[PDB]
Amino acid sequence: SRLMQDPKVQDWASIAGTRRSLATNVPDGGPRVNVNLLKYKRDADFISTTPYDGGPSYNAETCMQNWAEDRRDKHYKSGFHPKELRRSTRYDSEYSARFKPTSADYVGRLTHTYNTTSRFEGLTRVGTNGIAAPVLPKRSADTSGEHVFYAKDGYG
Amino acid sequence: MREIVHIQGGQCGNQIGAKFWEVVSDEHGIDPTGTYHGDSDLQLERINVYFNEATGGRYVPRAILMDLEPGTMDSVRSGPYGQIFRPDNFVFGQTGAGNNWAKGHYTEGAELIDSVLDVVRKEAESCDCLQGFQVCHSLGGGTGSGMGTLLISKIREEYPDRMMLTFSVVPSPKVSDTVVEPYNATLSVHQLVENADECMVLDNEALYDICFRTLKLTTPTFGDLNHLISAVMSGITCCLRFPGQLNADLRKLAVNLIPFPRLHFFMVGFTPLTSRGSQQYRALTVPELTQQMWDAKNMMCAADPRHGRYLTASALFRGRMSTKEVDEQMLNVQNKNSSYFVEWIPNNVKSSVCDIPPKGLKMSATFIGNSTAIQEMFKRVSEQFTAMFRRKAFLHWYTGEGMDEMEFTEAESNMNDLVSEYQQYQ
Amino acid sequence: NLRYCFISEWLDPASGILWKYQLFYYPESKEVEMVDIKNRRHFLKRTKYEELKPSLLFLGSVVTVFSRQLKLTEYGDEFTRNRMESQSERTLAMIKPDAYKNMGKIINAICQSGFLISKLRIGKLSKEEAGEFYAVHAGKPFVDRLTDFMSSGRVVAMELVAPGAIRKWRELIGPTDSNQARAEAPGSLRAQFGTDKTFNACHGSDAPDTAAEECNFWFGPGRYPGKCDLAAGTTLCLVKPHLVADGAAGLVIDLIQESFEVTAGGLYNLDRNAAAEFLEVYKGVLPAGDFNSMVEQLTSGACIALEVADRDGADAVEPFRQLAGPLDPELGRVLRPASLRARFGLDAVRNGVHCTDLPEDGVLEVNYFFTILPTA
Amino acid sequence: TQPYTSYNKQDEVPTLIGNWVEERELKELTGVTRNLAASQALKDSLGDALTATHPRVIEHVQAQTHAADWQSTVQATYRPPSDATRNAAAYVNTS
Amino acid sequence: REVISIHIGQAGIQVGNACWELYCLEHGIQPDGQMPDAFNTFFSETGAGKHVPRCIFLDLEPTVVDEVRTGTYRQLFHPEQLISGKEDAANNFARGHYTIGKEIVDLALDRIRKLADNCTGLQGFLVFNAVGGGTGSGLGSLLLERLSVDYGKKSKLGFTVYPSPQVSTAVVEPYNSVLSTHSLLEHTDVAVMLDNEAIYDICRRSLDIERPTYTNLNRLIAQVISSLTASLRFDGALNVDITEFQTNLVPYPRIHFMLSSYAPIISAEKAYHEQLSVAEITNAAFEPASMMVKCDPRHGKYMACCLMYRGDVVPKDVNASVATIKTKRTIQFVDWCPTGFKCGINYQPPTVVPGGDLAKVQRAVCMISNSTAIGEIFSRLDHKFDLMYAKRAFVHWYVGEGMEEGEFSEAREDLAALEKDFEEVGA
Amino acid sequence: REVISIHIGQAGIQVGNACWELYCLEHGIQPDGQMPSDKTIGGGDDAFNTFFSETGAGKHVPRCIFLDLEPTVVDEVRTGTYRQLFHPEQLISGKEDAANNFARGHYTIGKEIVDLALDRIRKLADNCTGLQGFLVFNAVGGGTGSGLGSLLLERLSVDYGKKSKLGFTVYPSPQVSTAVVEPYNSVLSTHSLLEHTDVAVMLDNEAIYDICRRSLDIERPTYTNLNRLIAQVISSLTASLRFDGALNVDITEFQTNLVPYPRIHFMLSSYAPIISAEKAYHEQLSVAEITNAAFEPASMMVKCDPRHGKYMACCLMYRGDVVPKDVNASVATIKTKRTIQFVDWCPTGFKCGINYQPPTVVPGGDLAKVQRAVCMISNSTAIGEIFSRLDHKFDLMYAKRAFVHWYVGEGMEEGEFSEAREDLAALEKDFEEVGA
């Protein structure tokens, strides 16, 4: 019943028959056991937006690796509100503070659209940290979104 | 399933067997009254190998007892675990041989071997799938060596396909019990090279020095030596009785250790062996078992392995273990002292693991070395045999019984041929 | 050199793996430490946290050290076991409908006198289960009338755990007579809020077994007796783990009962998943970080749920929300000092209480807390 | 090499000549030092064959594994999947 | 589509006991037999609410078999589908091939025939065994022969357990391995080696378990098998079947021996550590420190490789990684064959076992290549067979069972011929 | 990081009997060898691993061997309170004493006992993994601790060589002395103690007598009290390995920071605050005063005058509640003071060290529980005065060939006497040269 309270039992149902030894006690370790096998080199051109090498990619929140074409995609949700509608001190870029939408009417149009559709369009995909998980394609034919005939819906 | 029929000959065989059935009864958790009183269900599944259910859980052993003087039978039944042997397995003469190979092999054998053959047959067809026979006896005595060897010949004639292990003690010069030890040793080993499958040589001096050094007992009576030999026997047969990671039966050990049909005299060891006062120093890990296992002072025979070359070796491990550490330890002990192993065989060491340690232990091992240093022991006997035969000492008590001189010449020639072959492969 | 060693498991949300950590608390240095059972490696050097309260562990709670909500599942050492089991003693301390009108005062008296309310419920029993309770006195006509009286009002049934709990509690009760205790020791509760020998208010238990079966009846493995609930016009109020830890629950229950009538109540831990689902209204409403902090604060320990009603019977959400004051604890304090979030609300995520803000969802939230949470 | 035991003839090891240390350890464990015959002879016909001989030859009080702990490796490694609770860290079901 | 698996020997059924644990866990089958259509390739549905595997365990010692019969999976296995002889073959090819085989294999194939008849869309057979022993090598080869004469055209994927060069458990495994391979050549269609030293080095290096037993080996071998069967079991973007190994990896009917690899071999703490991506695991599947057979492909030239992918795999990335591999000059391909890759993708990620040391990975790669380092392996075993045979060691055991020295000499010259073939191909 | 300790002689194993008592109560180990069943040892607690190896489950055997020829003190240990701590195969014991005879202990009985010592220390080092070094305990005045102690050091140096050997020796005091030929034994020990050990710390007896007389105000001490505070010094110097500090040092540091020349390795030790239970309540013990207290000769472990010498280097262990600001301020004040002076050619002469765990008390002991403590290990030329003092009384007895016939009766000659005498003379010249 007391599996972790007393060690001899720990030995008893350890598979090997003995419990893991202390770090200092183990004869071989450290620099030898390093799993550096999962290593690669990313060849990056001076202005390449996205990597074709096949290395891992940063999230769309981070501004790198073809972030622009992604931020500007239709099935992409950001856990935080856009800069144009933000309101406080604390993390105002100098440019952002001085350059704000001049016309209150324009702000009104902006806020109507944003609130009705994009603010709560998706919320399940939002994780605990607030960083939306990328939609993961399932099935051979699954298409993320329309790319060729882009103007599927017109006039709004 | 696979069935081991135990045979005990003479005084040494009867007392060793008495301790052996004590240990086996211990490890299967049966009380000396004959009923099961263990707790784990790992034990009820493999008692058919060593016992038979009679009625009401009365598990009686499948053993045959053989001697010629009622002193040994009384010592069998006077001790605990005495009244579990079947009264019909007390097959037993009345006159006594007394250190005479001729008496034990031609006169007393003539009217005792038929009745014990009736008993061994009955106890053989009583079970279904024989694994083989396991016999424990001596070589110096008369009623053990001669009678037992005649039985070995008779059973290897009738059942030629079953395995056969012989645990036989051999004489020693500094500890020499009887006077005609060479006259009995030579004739018995001459018959064992032709009939027994594999012989695991024991001796008293090596056991004696073991209780000196490793156990640090003050007075090692026979009960201690008998328990050590019995511990080795259980360590051998552990594979059939308990599940393991790599099971290794008796035939599996014979093919991994016998490269040539006459080349089958092993030496044995057992680990761990530490004193009562030092049970706490040691941890139970593979290196600490192995440094003791390959120690020359842990051999149960008086043949220094450092004075020859190992041909093959085998290790039977018991207890939950890590096979990686088991094998890398075997590889290290094979590579470090590489000169002591034969050259034309790679991987001299067979290993095996079973998951149940002997009761009172955590992790044990049993070593069986088929070395070439055993010719030292046989030369130790042959020079004494030639010294006696040179002037026909004590010969007439053999000649007057039917035996002639060419028997002695045949025994000496064969033993000399055998030690020549060991010297060849060294 | 003192250790209190517990076994406490933590499941990282990211890997979804639950491992057991050995958690040592040194009460002399107000210091904490923990090691990993599986890999036999240190997890904390032996850092001095002193954030935690040596009253807050008690083998049940969730301790928070470096943003790891880890709950203590088992007693690590026999020495710790003995020392703690010597402290923890089970008692039932239900109140009677007479002083129910001032339960918060009584509960504040309890928490200040030194106790731990491990379980709490508020319900009114019908006569059948009323007779189920007090069953061992089925023959007495005195008790045969008590088993009817007790089923009239709204009864608080609450457990208490403390060293010498039975003794200390039965003492603070005072003898079955109210008036002679008023004459002897007015500080005793039954003397402070007692009418007659039959209209006492501060019932408790007297023997360990006769407390075991009574707590089993009230709390039980899966029992929910005499549920008292209202349909509409009544709002919710969540007394957060902060105030139940610092015992201030007594200071707020009476503070709200003076103006409103509590209808139901209960103290029950709640899971992250369950806690997060309950605040779904606030996901798109608040920034992600602050909503996360709120949900984890709500799942950071025990919490009390008062089902606040109104006197007139018109509506509760509007007046009670003003009673709570501004959501910010600090902003409310400067211009709304009468609100309770200003009175004992600590900080932004550590505010005092939680109150529903849309009159549409009052019934939704209360019926969630009082039907769907217990039956799941 | 050779033990020297001319003292402590009686079933007690007061003096420290010879190998008193393992003799003393054995005395606490079985109550009989050297041969079981000597103790009976002092206590006082019968011989000395009847000896316990387990705790003298092979036994390790600390590392003894009770038959309750006897389990084959396959049993100890293929636990029922649904309720396995012999491991510290396991991926918990998290619907 | 259905596939049946047979397990021979002490190693065969212990690996199978890990493999069928993984299958039950992957399709969510309780160990008593019922769920709380993709399973149809392994578990048949009997009656209502009951699944019974398409497998046979067989051995000549009844110990480990009825050890399974009293294990955790008692109701799951068919009582009859566990064949058990009464006595061992004891590291003896002739004993395992002529004495007991003649009475065990008839019942075995009379059982596998009605397994196949209850099946409908049989893909082929898939056999696990070890050649170093007597039970697995002897009647494993005998059953392989008699399955070939019965069905033949059905492929037979063989996952064998060879002896490692220095780490070794027996003595006569040279003889048993040699006499096994003479039939492993002409009857197995695709043979995959599974050493023991290489996996020990993997378990001590990657998963850093310092005292590894056979179970850990059996668990990650099960991972490999389930990874290369995942294509038939689940739907993926680019599915491959059992007939593909036959075609895309066997350029000549006598060269079918594969080096295997699996990535990522990562414990529960290093998954948090490392950012698993397709490029580095495709790289990591090629270093010798991640192959399941102890040999160095730097000494040889690849002929053809196959790569199963499980989990979140986008084809642009796998194509890019293998492009960087082809342009990398550390490893070299043979020119006889220019386009020597084959990919395959399945959607589901590999599962974990409670108590396993492998963490829940997002994506995994199983590489099955062909090379000439295998030709180096057979020579390394050939030399130590010659050392022993020159002195006529251990021969009397086999001859006593009934064989001669002719089968020794012809199996020796057979392996010599195969040595000449790998030398000619590698050119 | 592990270090093992060998105890050679009557004095050594009595010091060890006090030292290992201190260690087990520092780690909360009951004398039977295992922790109290009530509390549970931390799963990943390797603090005790540096000395104690955990064999199996719930047992800790020290990494040390007591060895001597006379069996009286050894089997006293075997029957004492710590029977269960050392089980009896490490406690090596001879059959007859060397009896204050260096030749008899280095040639006659050493040849029988040293091989057993070596092949036991071999398997102890084989159980060991990250061996830092050895540390030996002996009093060079006697015969056993001197003679075979020198032989054991010689064969250890030829076995490992590169590993450091901390030699805590006990030199004979000038006026207080219980032996007669200990001058002879001391010169013959030094002839090998020079070229074998790397770091050798002197502990005199009269100095410790004066410490317990003055500070601990014990008018009459026995050897129990002396060995008790010696154990305090050893434990204070190894606490940097056993317990994590803010600024820790290992065994190899004294090898570098303290030994400027490969022959000048003799370190005066001292300790503070050596204070009783009453002086403690009355007097506050902060860092500045204990740093001062560590430098007067009234608290040193060797009866010598550091004012007559110039410091080559110093090292300061601080245990307990010590922040680095005020140890920094204190060594600043010491460096600016002119009552003591460092040797001119080395400007930086300090080696500070801070450890968190304070020193503990022993039950029945006389030292009270202090919040902090200081162990000073220095190097000066006063030792060069000490060796001359021993050299004088060696030459006085050698001038009449007194007691020489015992050594020659054992098998030695006059050559080793003359060469040891000139060896100490060359040693004297080297201290006088370096001090300039």
Ligand SMILES: Nc1nc2c(ncn2[C@@H]2O[C@H](COP(=O)(O)OP(=O)(O)OP(=O)(O)O)[C@@H](O)[C@H]2O)c(=O)[nH]1
């Ligand atoms: N990797 C791995 N190898 C195993 C396992 N079990 C057995 N083996 C290998 O099998 C080889 C010996 O053959 P065994 O399986 O033990 O026995 P066998 O093949 O059935 O032949 P017999 O002993 O005659 O019954 C050993 O060298 C092991 O390497 C296992 O569970 N995992």
Ligand SMILES: Nc1nc2c(ncn2[C@@H]2O[C@H](COP(=O)(O)OP(=O)(O)OP(=O)(O)O)[C@@H](O)[C@H]2O)c(=O)[nH]1
């Ligand atoms: N510090 C300390 N020194 C001691 C103690 N006992 C003896 N000594 C010193 O040891 C010196 C003599 O050597 P001993 O230790 O008594 O005996 P030995 O070194 O074993 O040499 P033998 O007597 O020949 O065996 C004396 O000058 C004492 O100063 C002790 O308990 N503590």
Ligand SMILES: Nc1nc2c(ncn2[C@@H]2O[C@H](COP(=O)(O)OP(=O)(O)O)[C@@H](O)[C@H]2O)c(=O)[nH]1
């Ligand atoms: N170890 C051991 N050896 C024994 C025992 N009984 C006899 N022997 C040995 O057997 C040899 C004599 O055997 P013996 O009794 O004459 O055989 P038998 O007369 O034919 O039965 C002697 O060298 C003894 O050392 C025993 O119980 N234990």
Ligand SMILES: [Mg+2]
């Ligand atoms: Mg097998």
Ligand SMILES: [Mg+2]
């Ligand atoms: Mg002395």
